[PDB]
Design a protein around this nucleic acid. Structure first.
Length: 169
DNA sequence: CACGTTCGCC
DNA sequence: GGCGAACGTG
């Protein structure tokens, strides 16, 4: 039947289908940092959704510490991309949600709308109860986004080190 | 500071 | 093209 394994391969295919903006030597880290943050919060049974102010500040902090490809603290980018992929719910806003195309209008949209948000339930609940799904998604994110980067400090800020650190010695 | 334009890429 | 994005250019 439909298992957490299949739910996990579904999530992973959806995560792999994301298209992050790319730098000269790799992908920008907005989306994996946002995903990894939600991964940790799901792992701990934290509240799925958060007001925008807390989300802005939590993801902003992770972007400033661990934005190793020149990321500026602008969670509005990854949240809109994740929302566009169906991976991130936003509520409390009026009208449709913009794409992550542009700059100041996106920042302003969150300032005015202040949407209630978080990673979508099927994946939140899945990540809360399945260590398998968490490990699998962390390793897909670290492989794709953190080649040539030290992921450990961001694994510690998300509470995922023991699931993101594979042993190789 | 804020907007319109530009870059990289499926 | 469209979107995830940064950046002149006033």
């Amino acid at each position: 039947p439909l298992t957490d394994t299949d739910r996990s391969e579904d999530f992973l295919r959806r995560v792999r289908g994301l298209k992050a903006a790319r730098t000269a030597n790799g992908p920008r880290l907005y989306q994996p940092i946002t995903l990894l943050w939600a991964v940790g919060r799901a792992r701990r049974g934290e509240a799925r959704t958060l007001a925008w102010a807390d989300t802005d500040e939590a993801i902003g902090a992770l972007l400033k510490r661990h934005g190793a490809r020149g990321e500026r603290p602008r969670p509005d980018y990854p949240v809109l991309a994740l929302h566009r992929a169906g991976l991130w719910t936003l509520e409390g806003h009026v009208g449709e949600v913009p794409t992550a195309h542009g700059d100041s209008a996106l920042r302003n949209w969150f300032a005015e709308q202040r949407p209630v948000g978080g990673l979508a339930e099927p994946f939140h609940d899945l990540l809360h109860r399945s260590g398998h799904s968490r490990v699998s998604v962390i390793e897909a994110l670290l492989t794709t986004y953190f080649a040539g980067l030290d992921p450990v400090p961001l694994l510690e800020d998300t509470g995922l080190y023991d699931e993101g650190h594979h042993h190789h010695h």
